[PDB]
Design a protein around this ligand. Structure first.
Ligand SMILES: [Cl-]
Length: 129
């Protein structure tokens, strides 16, 4: 599924991400934009052989099992394919674990490089939340 901007904002809002660990909603929408272009089916292979999955490009190196990332962990205790659903629940639940873990939203490279230190409020402008 390719989410609309406000459609995803609203979905992230009702799943409790607005100001979760102090990260306003715009940060989560900005992250999803530049990780997946709002596409729940997005997958990308990393140079080390792990793969990033779904709307927030969650990495098989640490967070989910895809059975083809040798030596990796599955900290969210879920198959990586579950993170590709049209329903973002699994990605959000795993994201909440990731963001509570140490370096916060810096765990998302696209957030660090394209959202952090910018005005992200624009990402939820005009949305019914
Ligand atoms: Cl849109």
């Amino acid at each position: 599924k390719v989410f609309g901007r406000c459609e995803l904002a609203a979905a992230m809002k009702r799943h409790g991400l607005d100001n979760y660990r102090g990260y306003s909603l715009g940060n989560w929408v900005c992250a999803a934009k530049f990780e997946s272009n709002f596409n729940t089916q997005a997958t990308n292979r990393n140079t080390d052989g792990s793969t990033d999955y779904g709307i927030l490009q969650i990495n098989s190196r640490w967070w989910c099992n895809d059975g083809r990332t040798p030596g990796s962990r599955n900290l969210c205790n879920i198959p990586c394919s579950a993170l590709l659903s049209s329903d973002i629940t699994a990605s959000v639940n795993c994201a909440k674990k990731i963001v509570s873990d140490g370096n916060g939203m810096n765990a998302w490279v696209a957030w660090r490089n394209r959202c952090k230190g910018t005005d992200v409020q624009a990402w939820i402008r005009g949305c019914r939340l």
